[PDB]
UniProtKB/TrEMBL annotation, chain B:
Keywords: Lyase, Metal-binding, Zinc. Belongs to the beta-class carbonic anhydrase family. The lineage of its organism: Eukaryota, Fungi, Dikarya, Ascomycota, Pezizomycotina. Its EC number is 4.2.1.1. GO terms for cellular component: cytoplasm. This is Carbonic anhydrase. SUPFAM superfamilies: beta-carbonic anhydrase, cab (SSF53056). Disulfide bonds join C37-C96. It comes from Aspergillus fumigatus (strain ATCC MYA-4609 / CBS 101355 / FGSC A1100 / Af293).
Length: 216, 201
């Protein structure tokens, strides 16, 4: 019932590491935290998986402060999730972000967890959103005979449907109609090469396509 | 532009710095879950002097853990039950604008129910906050109490209570990140006491 000591010193070591990190930044730039604390308005909302590999801003060669960030299991945008719907609403309506990106990769454990028949308890309802993506694209995925190619295509279609879910929001549709931003993109990050790849989500075409069923 | 930056970033990472792409795909298990605000200033792993890969991450408006939010409850459940993370941290700072938005009587539409969680923190600590006359100092204390109640919400989860009872991990910590100095400040939450408090019910 007491906290093991190895957990207390693991925790202390973080603070030692933090003090050391501050010293080297102080040596490299004497006003760096002064400039950090200097204002900024993010231009990007980035939605990625909680299974992060590299900070968003560093992949994109931007300052951390130019990217407002959300990470969740399997980089989902479910209809009735007030968590992700609040980040989208705030980013669009308060930050007036010019770009929203959904970025996946082939090693998010969330998507893999969606395909195991196991009871993951509380996780099942969240990962149900990944299985709905399989249903929307069932013929395409059934016709890929290589398991690893099929899995990789599911990861990409999950990014694309998350993007479509962003585009379907009132905030994105109304902002785009009246100000021609934000624009939504779907990307894949390759861990093996460190390269971003555009899925070429057709924003203009997708936004037009959505209007029939989903306008405002 | 972004993709140019990305190619250049891969170069300096494989030219101006060392080649660590094998490590990127090497595979590791995070020892930390970090819950912060979507208004990021510095990557978690860099504040903590760890590899990005040692820290499983969630960011949301005002670093909240609301009871009925399946989004954050799924990251907690996965981190505890699948990743077997040894630490969960909630880290706030004084420039997440969600907390400030929660104190203006404005209708923020869809945001009202999310930010209602911040107003509930004011109510749980109303005497404490009413006694601070300086707006700025009162705001700063609200940011800290918001971290602490987020941490208490983590401790109250089935996943954390059951994991800690049977395996003595994870432990939960609340931190405040000071952007001016870059230093983490421990909020020194009552982990053992909250756990004992939960069993009274």
């Amino acid at each position: 019932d007491t906290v093991p000591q190895y957990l207390k010193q693991s925790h202390e070591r973080i603070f030692e590491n933090n003090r050391a990190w501050v010293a080297t930044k102080m040596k490299d730039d004497p006003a760096f935290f002064e400039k950090l604390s200097a204002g900024q308005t993010p231009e990007y909302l980035y939605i990625g998986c909680s299974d992060s590999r590299v900070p968003a801003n560093e992949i994109m060669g931007l300052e951390a402060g130019e990217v407002f960030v959300h990470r969740n299991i399997a980089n989902l945008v479910p209809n009735t999730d007030l968590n992700v719907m609040s980040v989208i609403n705030y980013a669009v309506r308060h930050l007036q972000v010019k770009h929203i990106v959904v970025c996946g990769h082939y090693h998010c454990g969330g998507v893999k967890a969606a395909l195991t028949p196991s009871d993951l308890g509380l996780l099942n309802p969240w990962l149900r959103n990944v299985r709905d993506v399989y249903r929307l694209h069932e013929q395409e995925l059934d016709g890929i005979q290589d398991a690893t190619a099929r899995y990789r295509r599911l990861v990409e279609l999950n990014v694309i449907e998350s993007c479509r879910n962003v585009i379907k929001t009132a905030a994105v549709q109304q902002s785009f109609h009246e100000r021609q931003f934000p624009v939504v993109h779907g990307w894949i990050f390759d861990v093996e090469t460190g390269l971003l790849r555009d899925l070429e989500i057709d924003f203009e075409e997708t936004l037009r396509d959505i209007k029939k069923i989903y306008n405002l």
